[PDB]
Design a protein around this ligand. Sequence first.
Ligand SMILES: NC(=O)C1=CN([C@@H]2O[C@H](COP(=O)(O)OP(=O)(O)OC[C@H]3O[C@@H](n4cnc5c(N)ncnc54)[C@H](O)[C@@H]3O)[C@@H](O)[C@H]2O)C=CC1
Ligand SMILES: NC(=O)C1=CN([C@@H]2O[C@H](COP(=O)(O)OP(=O)(O)OC[C@H]3O[C@@H](n4cnc5c(N)ncnc54)[C@H](O)[C@@H]3O)[C@@H](O)[C@H]2O)C=CC1
Ligand SMILES: NC(=O)C1=CN([C@@H]2O[C@H](COP(=O)(O)OP(=O)(O)OC[C@H]3O[C@@H](n4cnc5c(N)ncnc54)[C@H](O)[C@@H]3O)[C@@H](O)[C@H]2O)C=CC1
Ligand SMILES: NC(=O)C1=CN([C@@H]2O[C@H](COP(=O)(O)OP(=O)(O)OC[C@H]3O[C@@H](n4cnc5c(N)ncnc54)[C@H](O)[C@@H]3O)[C@@H](O)[C@H]2O)C=CC1
Ligand SMILES: NC(=O)C1=CN([C@@H]2O[C@H](COP(=O)(O)OP(=O)(O)OC[C@H]3O[C@@H](n4cnc5c(N)ncnc54)[C@H](O)[C@@H]3O)[C@@H](O)[C@H]2O)C=CC1
Ligand SMILES: NC(=O)C1=CN([C@@H]2O[C@H](COP(=O)(O)OP(=O)(O)OC[C@H]3O[C@@H](n4cnc5c(N)ncnc54)[C@H](O)[C@@H]3O)[C@@H](O)[C@H]2O)C=CC1
Ligand SMILES: O=C(O)/C=C/C(=O)O
Ligand SMILES: O=C(O)/C=C/C(=O)O
Ligand SMILES: O=C(O)/C=C/C(=O)O
Ligand SMILES: [Mn+2]
Ligand SMILES: [Mn+2]
Ligand SMILES: [Mn+2]
Lengths: 553, 553, 553
Amino acid sequence: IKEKGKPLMLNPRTNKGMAFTLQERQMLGLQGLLPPKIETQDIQALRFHRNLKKMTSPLEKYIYIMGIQERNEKLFYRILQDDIESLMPIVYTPTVGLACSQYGHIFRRPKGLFISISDRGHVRSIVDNWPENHVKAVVVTDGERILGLGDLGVYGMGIPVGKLCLYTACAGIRPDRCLPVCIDVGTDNIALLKDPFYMGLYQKRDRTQQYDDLIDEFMKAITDRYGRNTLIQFEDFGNHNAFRFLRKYREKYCTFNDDIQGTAAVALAGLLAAQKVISKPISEHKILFLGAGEAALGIANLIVMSMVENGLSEQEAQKKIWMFDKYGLLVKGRKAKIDSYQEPFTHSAPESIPDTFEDAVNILKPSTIIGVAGAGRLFTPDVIRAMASINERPVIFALSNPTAQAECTAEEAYTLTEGRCLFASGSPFGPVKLTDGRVFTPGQGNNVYIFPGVALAVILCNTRHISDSVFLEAAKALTSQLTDEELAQGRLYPPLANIQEVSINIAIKVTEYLYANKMAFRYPEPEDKAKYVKERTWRSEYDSLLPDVYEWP
Amino acid sequence: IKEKGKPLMLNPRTNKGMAFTLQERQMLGLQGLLPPKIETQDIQALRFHRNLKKMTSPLEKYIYIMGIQERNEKLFYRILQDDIESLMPIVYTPTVGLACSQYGHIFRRPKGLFISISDRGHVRSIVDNWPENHVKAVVVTDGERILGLGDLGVYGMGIPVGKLCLYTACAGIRPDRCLPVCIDVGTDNIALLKDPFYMGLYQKRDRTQQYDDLIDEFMKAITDRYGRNTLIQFEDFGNHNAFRFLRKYREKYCTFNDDIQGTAAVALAGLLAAQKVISKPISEHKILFLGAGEAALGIANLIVMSMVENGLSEQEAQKKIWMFDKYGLLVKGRKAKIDSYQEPFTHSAPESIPDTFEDAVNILKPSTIIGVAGAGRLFTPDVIRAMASINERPVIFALSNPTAQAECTAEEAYTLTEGRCLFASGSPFGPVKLTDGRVFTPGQGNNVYIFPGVALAVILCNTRHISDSVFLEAAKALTSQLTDEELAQGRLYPPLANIQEVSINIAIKVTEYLYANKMAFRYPEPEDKAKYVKERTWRSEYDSLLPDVYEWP
Amino acid sequence: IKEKGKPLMLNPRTNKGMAFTLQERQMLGLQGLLPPKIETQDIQALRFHRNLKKMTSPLEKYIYIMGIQERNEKLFYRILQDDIESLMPIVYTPTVGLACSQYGHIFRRPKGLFISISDRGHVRSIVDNWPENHVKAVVVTDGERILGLGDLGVYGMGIPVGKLCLYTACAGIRPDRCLPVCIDVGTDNIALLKDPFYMGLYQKRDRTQQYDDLIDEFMKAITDRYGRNTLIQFEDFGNHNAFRFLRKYREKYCTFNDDIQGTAAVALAGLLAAQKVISKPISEHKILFLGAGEAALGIANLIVMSMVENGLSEQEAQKKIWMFDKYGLLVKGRKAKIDSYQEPFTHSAPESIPDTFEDAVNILKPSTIIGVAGAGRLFTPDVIRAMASINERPVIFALSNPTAQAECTAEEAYTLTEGRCLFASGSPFGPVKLTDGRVFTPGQGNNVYIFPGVALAVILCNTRHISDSVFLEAAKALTSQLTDEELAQGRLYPPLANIQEVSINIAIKVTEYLYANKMAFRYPEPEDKAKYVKERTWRSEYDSLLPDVYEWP
Ligand SMILES: NC(=O)C1=CN([C@@H]2O[C@H](COP(=O)(O)OP(=O)(O)OC[C@H]3O[C@@H](n4cnc5c(N)ncnc54)[C@H](O)[C@@H]3O)[C@@H](O)[C@H]2O)C=CC1
Ligand SMILES: NC(=O)C1=CN([C@@H]2O[C@H](COP(=O)(O)OP(=O)(O)OC[C@H]3O[C@@H](n4cnc5c(N)ncnc54)[C@H](O)[C@@H]3O)[C@@H](O)[C@H]2O)C=CC1
Ligand SMILES: NC(=O)C1=CN([C@@H]2O[C@H](COP(=O)(O)OP(=O)(O)OC[C@H]3O[C@@H](n4cnc5c(N)ncnc54)[C@H](O)[C@@H]3O)[C@@H](O)[C@H]2O)C=CC1
Ligand SMILES: NC(=O)C1=CN([C@@H]2O[C@H](COP(=O)(O)OP(=O)(O)OC[C@H]3O[C@@H](n4cnc5c(N)ncnc54)[C@H](O)[C@@H]3O)[C@@H](O)[C@H]2O)C=CC1
Ligand SMILES: NC(=O)C1=CN([C@@H]2O[C@H](COP(=O)(O)OP(=O)(O)OC[C@H]3O[C@@H](n4cnc5c(N)ncnc54)[C@H](O)[C@@H]3O)[C@@H](O)[C@H]2O)C=CC1
Ligand SMILES: NC(=O)C1=CN([C@@H]2O[C@H](COP(=O)(O)OP(=O)(O)OC[C@H]3O[C@@H](n4cnc5c(N)ncnc54)[C@H](O)[C@@H]3O)[C@@H](O)[C@H]2O)C=CC1
Ligand SMILES: O=C(O)/C=C/C(=O)O
Ligand SMILES: O=C(O)/C=C/C(=O)O
Ligand SMILES: O=C(O)/C=C/C(=O)O
Ligand SMILES: [Mn+2]
Ligand SMILES: [Mn+2]
Ligand SMILES: [Mn+2]
């Protein structure tokens, strides 16, 4: 490091608290500024869990652990490392959504960059204000579609912050190379415009061309200072902007959209694991989505790429996918609109026009149901029963987040199908024991299983662009890690407790894929991709800060 | 910049002296720390020239101007840019040599990084001590062969410093992106080892494997911190080491040796200029070298490549070249050793064995004489007359530096050949006027015309390896700028006064060459290379340091 | 030491150069930034004297050593300490006057605080930009009366800088606690108003209420930040502003005017020494001043106090003093003005009014002549001859500075009076050897023998105000250190070569005087004033910058 003395303690990237050794204190001007006691990171972790055990609400736990990231970075991650499964719900979905809807009530310190429409023309100067000189990964949101909570404006900064925590906790990406970003062009949230604690501009969203220019100016500014190959992950943008920005920049920068592409991969991985148990002919596979937005289209497009890779033409596969949105079933010539992306899955109206999602299930008789509407408990008991009656082993994915917007619970899916369904959800649910002793451990179909591993691979290989093919390879890399014993439990995904090793493995597989397809530019090409990746992961163990002292001959 | 206040004035990189505008001083905390007067860089320039003109000795002018580099970087380069031609002999050769032989007496502040054998195993920590974060180019020496002055140890640091100033002065390579380096493993200079002002370790050179490993450690440290693409220019390394390191690293790193390859392109560019005068074919020209070291072998190899590029084969080309070293004519089976690089130019002993260099000229009757033995006035009157009697338009290159080690003077060569010789020297020589009022302006055969333009291209194209073929095009690029009128005056090279435009022009050719030959990795490839290179050269004009202030809507 | 890395080398306060030990280099992040050689201050000193020896002009040597102050403060004073006597003429008078005349030509880096009239209402903001936190002594000037050179505007900043160097070199006052200040309200010097290099405001002097308000503002801003007892020494202000500001502030701040009071003490001390080689009766003392401004009036009033301290009343002592300015003898009723301060020394026109200073010498027949007109050689040979015939041992003091403005030289004084005079001058003159062989060593009556010791005592005792009594004591303290031998050489002051010891002795005696008269507020009162002062003098030897590293039991 460059500085010594108090500054070392005030900066969380370097502060170690009482873990600063005696020599470090004396040589770096800290003696007397710390209590006489010398501690280990282990003692500090104990302090943490000791106090966490006594806390009552998830939000309170969020504020506390999240505060550690602003005081002692190394320890913050040592804490996540100790038990990522139990803390995931706190730092990530669903509690992060809770934090976001209340971001202005719990604010203590800011985190990340805020670029508003009012800064148009001066974005580059905002990017130069960021302290870190070598940013490799950016996660950006404009806060219009925060989880299934809708438009939360700048209160959505909570999402990019959470995603990045996982870049480091899951894939070992250096936190100092990560930058959370929030684009504030206003918010249509009437309640927030009336909140005296709101953190953004008090104006409705700017949807004119100035908005696209702002985004343009941001992509330009970020790459100018950090590099053309800086990984830019779009997160929680509205439906229209999400697809547009993805297609406008995907071939120009090293960018992707988590909601559209990372989701697609995790979902596909779940369906793959499922096919392992079901083993049914793909000619008998009929899928039906509740909702036809970002994730539905992304999932459907990757399912098609999977089916095509498996024989069917692109046109035959798309006919095997249906969608049901807020206006009803997506069929040709319906009163409600249908965008360019939905058309491919908009088919000739069947015998009857289903009025409810239930009718749709009975009429179309799908074998797989995927909920991604973010509208609540729409996979009603009748839907689940209809599914269990129609299929011996129905696949039921309720992916909407947070928990209250989920289509159904694990407990509802398993009991209403007598333990026959193959379930996955976006938000966490604990094990389910049926009235007959059978225990079913549900898996979490959440994009966190993908973006960390993919991001690591892309950064390490100096990749310039990300094609949909990477996510397909990621899908296969995730489900390829499922053992048969975990399959028996009802797990369509590796245990969340192993998310770190699982992410690394996905990173290794994707790096092998990028190189083999001339998508990597990090020369020389590593001989052992496995040893290469593992060798470059950031660790939470304290580094010695002592200067290099030695005797001259 | 991150700081404000006095530090801005203490760091030459940012210090503008009285050039800081009123608004900059108020907002940065300099009000009152500077005189009320607001000056322009133009005024600062005048002050400089006013003082220099009063100065008497070259060394004195050296101390003064080099002192400016450590007070106001921008001003330093503006001063050079003002009149590169007249300042060249002061900051560069021959005065730079004078400075080196006396580095310990005129020392005020150190420049660049010093890595000593005593720091083995701890070289990375030394590299990390360097303030600048984005280093793109390194010029390193061990002071074994400083000009034709010999082993000067750490006193040779003056060379890497002098070389880098030209990177900026000539080719516009950002100064903060440059790093001069001195590897001190001791020195054999008996006198220095007795001087109380010597700046190096008091011990003779370490020629064991430790030297090799130190160099290895250095290459690894630099690359690891700044990127394996970082340009490493080897300068004034002893004979043995110069070749071996070039061979060993040109494949692994983006390195090259200036004394071997840079010179090769200058000397070749000279001959190419001669051709447009003599028109003499390639089946013509019998070349004789005085000395067979780094530069001779380098020029020979590039010459051969140009002949082979024009019909002739390598075997019949290498025969048109002869070398005479401190041991006499280099012929097969002679007593003196003949290294691997010299073998290709070691032909069967002639009918008679040349006793002295004058004899070798009469017997062999060369049409081009090239001196690079750093041994003195060896292109004696007799030697020059002989070349006159034997040729109509003889080519005489006395490239040895500094001035006192050159083979002959511009006057000696022109008067002794009645103005028919085509001359070039390593160090500068003023115009020559013959008794018949005929005036000849001799060019300078110095690699300064090469390394700057090449360095700029390599760096801008993100090149990873430098092939000798880059130098061949470098030579062509240089000569392709010699206008007819300049040929007449007796100029084998573009006027040294235009060395800036020449360098930029060269850089453009090489970048187009590099891309056209898939050696460039800077994406996207620029359509207009010219526009590309000129947009990226560093300017000596002052930049505003004002924060980005603006009103919100 | 709170900073590490390059910053330690860029700051002259901490820069040790190659004297940084290996241990400090490794622990402070300097390894590799300095040559492998470890030097001592002794070696660096040698390098300095070696180069100084070569130099030809005094201004050149000035530019050189003053540059060292801006690079290595410790070494700067070591060099001065090594031979304060020979460097005195270069760093102080007369060369410092030459430097001020060319300040804008030789400018490299600014020194001190610059407060301009354009800054009124923001002076505190300027004072807060000064890097040092504990300032104890300020020396300020407006540059209207720089030596006998006149109005030099901001070019006069060189004077305060020169005085402060002596604060440290002579009295051991801490460099970082001294603050040179230049108040710029414009200049009347027409030459500078058309000089493109002039460092000040381009306007004639502002003499409205604004001037006075600026100074008031300055005085308040300084004390507000550093303390009401911050020693503030006024230097080279115009005659009208010198007395009025001294009168206005001497009871509100810890301030004094060097030109009026310091001079007074050194001049009187010279007379006191003279009396010891003449034993002349007070009733025989007749003093005539050439000039009647700051210096003259200051000296007169101090002489008057010494006489009153010995019996004579104010009235009778005051009549022993005559003055002659640029309009002639000050006699009651003369057409030329006579201000309040001059009245006590304005007599009734004698029988015949002397037209020239020679007529005044012959008519009044004084026994002591003191020149402070700064108008050149007014002590013509006829004048000196007249003094030789009226008095057996004529007292001749040519105090005007620099040398060209002196009233006469040392050679002219001793030669013209045949060695029967007691001579002293404001500027240095070497020894004088008459044809008869006799050698005379002239003393230098310059306020440099006073302000250092006086300021040191005033600072160490936390004195709130300085009365004329202090200077009367300093005057006595200085002459008391004179040893007969030296007095026998023609010395009216102790050898300049020992100004360090002499200054300290004056500091001791003055501190004892301040306490004895309850003017000192430093508590507790030191028992041994000598050990108290000697212990607090700053030293030039290097201090270890090593952190306090120790093991715990
Ligand atoms: N678990 C995971 O990895 C991921 C989960 N999601 C979740 O999926 C939900 C939607 O996200 P996006 O597709 O990006 O949103 P979007 O706004 O792009 O699409 C929403 C879709 O749901 C439909 N919809 C709304 N109400 C409906 C209703 N009452 N009945 C039937 N359909 C209805 C809309 O017509 C629209 O087609 C969110 O809650 C989000 O958190 C999104 C990405 C990944
Ligand atoms: N744009 C860039 O990435 C640039 C990198 N460099 C330097 O190159 C050095 C790396 O050398 P290589 O052996 O080529 O790289 P590498 O093999 O260590 O890794 C390749 C790329 O992945 C990044 N990386 C490594 N670990 C990372 C982590 N844990 N989290 C996030 N990003 C990580 C690196 O910055 C590098 O750009 C670095 O020390 C850096 O200072 C210099 C200029 C630009
Ligand atoms: N391999 C590399 O050099 C990479 C550089 N970057 C980043 O990209 C930024 C520059 O923008 P790009 O469009 O990539 O490059 P560019 O097209 O502006 O220039 C290409 C290379 O030449 C260097 N450069 C430009 N002008 C220079 C000058 N006048 N003197 C010395 N070096 C000069 C740049 O640092 C860059 O590495 C840098 O700040 C760097 O952090 C990111 C990835 C790789
Ligand atoms: N102007 C330019 O661009 C360049 C000029 N030079 C200058 O050329 C000189 C040598 O450079 P390198 O080839 O690197 O050195 P080197 O040490 O590799 O080669 C020296 C050669 O000269 C020969 N030699 C020594 N004394 C001799 C004598 N008394 N009579 C005949 N031959 C003798 C040696 O046998 C040896 O082959 C130096 O003075 C150097 O400054 C080197 C590179 C470029
Ligand atoms: N970093 C800082 O700002 C520091 C400030 N101090 C100051 O020192 C005072 C404590 O008194 P001591 O230092 O024990 O001495 P002291 O009390 O014996 O000295 C009396 C006064 O003379 C001044 N002084 C002593 N030597 C001086 C010198 N060589 N040159 C110029 N001024 C000198 C001191 O500032 C002090 O105000 C405190 O008022 C404290 O504010 C002490 C250490 C550090
Ligand atoms: N050696 C020392 O320690 C000191 C020497 N001086 C020197 O004394 C000189 C005057 O200083 P200040 O009293 O502050 O100046 P001032 O401006 O206050 O007074 C100058 C006096 O000299 C008179 N004068 C000018 N030309 C004259 C002439 N042609 N003939 C007779 N009298 C003439 C003026 O009328 C005026 O009374 C300066 O050259 C200065 O450098 C001042 C302070 C200390
Ligand atoms: O530090 C806090 O808890 C809150 C700060 C704020 O309200 O800005
Ligand atoms: O001897 C030194 O290290 C410094 C010399 C200077 O600043 O002139
Ligand atoms: O003219 C200036 O501002 C500085 C000159 C120098 O540092 O030499
Ligand atoms: Mn999302
Ligand atoms: Mn060289
Ligand atoms: Mn004065």
